[PDB]
Structure 1
Amino acid sequence: KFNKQKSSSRRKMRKAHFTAPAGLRRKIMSSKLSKELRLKYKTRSLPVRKDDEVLICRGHNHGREGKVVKINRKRYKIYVERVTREKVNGESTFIGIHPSNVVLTKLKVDKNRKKILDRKA
């Protein structure tokens, strides 16, 4: 707003969002975390990863929950374990869910994540 250095142009921001490199896309991957999680980790939002556990709260399956299995930053979608959809050909696929429609419930830790939690701390 008051920062004239950065633009508020519709086309500029849309181009930035739709041609963002994956490093910036992983930050748009961010989603809210539940109330208990927010109390514990003192923050409000975090990006997602292939072994987080999430609860979707918008869309045709706004009640389901589960461990997300894969995220792809090109389509801006995440996929949770048991929201599979049957295709016309007759074999199962995954329903893409926007990260903004879900709330985190749990997080996974690894050799990578044992310092992502430290930086987010």
Structure 2
Amino acid sequence: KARKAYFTAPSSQRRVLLSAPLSKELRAQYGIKALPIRRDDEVLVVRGSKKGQEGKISSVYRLKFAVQVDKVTKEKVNGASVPINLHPSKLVITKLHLDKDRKALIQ
């Protein structure tokens, strides 16, 4: 159909598309379905082959549609290191870099 307002929308609503589920612990304590994947947050790559593997979502390349996890990185057999683009809503929000703003948002 449309699906281009999709594959062609502005960050102002690309974060909220690049979203992610909350940790059982978190999804119980804090008590929210999920949220707008946030940076200084931590997570645990749920069902992707780099499974269970864990760490912090350094940056999120929205203009690439996909967020990246610090430690979890793709290794070159060529003495070099390169990030491994991870798809937000397939990880799981371990802990949130909760800020008065993101805080408030919890409604």
Code of the aligned partner of 1:118 = A
CA distance in 1 between counterparts of 2:105 and 2:72 reads: 32
Query: 1:7 matched to which residue of 2?
Result: none
Decide which of 58, 81, 86 is 1:92's aligned counterpart: 81
Aligned-partner Cα distance in 1 for 2:30–2:72 = 28
Q: Comparing 86-95 with 32-41, which one deviates more in the overlay?
A: 86-95
The answer to whether structure 1 residue 63 and structure 2 residue 52 are counterparts is yes
Cα distance, 1:38 vs structure 2? 1.3
Separation in structure 2 between the aligned mates of residue 93 and residue 15 of structure 1, nearest angstrom: 30
Tell me the secondary structure at the aligned position of residue 66 of structure 1.
strand
**What's the TM-score, normalizing by structure 2?**
0.90
Alignment: residue pair count = 107
CA distance in 2, matches of 1:59, 1:105: 16
What is the distance in 1 between the residues matched to 2:53 and 2:5?
A: 32
The structure that is strand-richer by fraction is: 1
Deviation string, structure 1 residues 33-90 (Cα, Å, up to 9, x no partner): 0121111222101111221000111222112011110001111111111111124754
Gaps of 5+ in 1: 1-9
Among 108, 111, 114, the alignment partner of 2:97 is 108
SS in 2 for 1:79: coil
Equivalent position amino acid for 1:106 in 2: K
The residue number in structure 2 matching 1:118 is 104
SS of residue paired to 1:59: coil
1:4 corresponds to? none
Q: TM-score, normalised by structure 1?
A: 0.80
Moved over 6 A (4+): none
Distance 2:94 2:75 in 1: 27
Task: Give the share of equivalent positions with the same residue, in percent.
Answer: 47
Name structure 2 gaps, 5 residues minimum.
none
